[PDB]
Design a protein around this nucleic acid. Sequence first.
DNA 1: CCGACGGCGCATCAGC
DNA 2: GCTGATGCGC
DNA 3: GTCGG
Length: 331
Amino acid sequence: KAPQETLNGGITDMLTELANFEKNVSQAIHKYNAYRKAASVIAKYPHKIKSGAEAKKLPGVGTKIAEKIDEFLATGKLRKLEKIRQDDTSSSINFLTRVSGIGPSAARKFVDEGIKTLEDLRKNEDKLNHHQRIGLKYFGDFEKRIPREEMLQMQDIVLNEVKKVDSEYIATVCGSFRRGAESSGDMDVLLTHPSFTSESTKQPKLLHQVVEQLQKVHFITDTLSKGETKFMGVCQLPSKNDEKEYPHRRIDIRLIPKDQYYCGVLYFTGSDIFNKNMRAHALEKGFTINEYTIRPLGVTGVAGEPLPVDSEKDIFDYIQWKYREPKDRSE
DNA sequence: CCGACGGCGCATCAGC
DNA sequence: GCTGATGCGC
DNA sequence: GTCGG
Ligand code: NA
Ligand code: NA
């Protein structure tokens, strides 16, 4: 259950700025993660907060954050923020990172080499790599929320081609999209083939082939990176005659060994909080999970040998939990 | 006090 | 050349 | 930055 706007947005928002600043400008992921974490739980939090103490209570919340929360309650702002908002470099530094391929080093490098806008980018592509190129290119597309309708749509295309290419494959769209989301950010493609498993001799072709196909059929426009197992690229929906071009979008496809799929599936489907809790119970029944497998916890304190997973269920099976519907994997 | 905090594929870079 | 290390995104 | 050894 989550309410939150006229409630604690002021806070969650400030925090997010904070987080960004750490990541991008700071180069402190942990700190970004920390601020995000705080931002989340408080998001979920049913009350009109009234102080830090109140929030301290939150798990994630703490001293400094709560300190902030007081100024903010009191002032309606965070002074830190104003100097940050007013500091040149920082902002530009935060902006550029928006650009897919551009991280904090690049972004800071650029800003030092004077570059600090799309333009500068545009006027400097000899100074960008591919990934960065496509990202600059697709800048607005990417930040576009994707529509499930489309998702569905997109969902269908990717779905058949694979089917066209080979019949034995398996794919599945994961993410919020799997969780039943009205909208998404990208398309996570989870796939595998029978001929591809754990101790098996890999067919790059497999993945290859699925790409090409989707390529062949002008589904996937660009290509961020690709190798025997992972492919990250740009894809689009064929334009309806006299109907303006939709947006281009993120899509990644992942190939997995059949023995680890569901784990992968399960893993990749989320939620994140869900995974945590699950990791927990699964543990309670004496096992340790991950993206790949499920292991029987050692009678000692830890002990190898992964179990036979033929489904998501099975997973659920081992830990004595009802096979949850991806829909309610909210946690 | 102090370490962990997800890890990994894939591209490009520093080096030998 | 290639190895490993670093950036990036997921 | 927060949590927890
Ligand atoms: Na706390
Ligand atoms: Na970026």
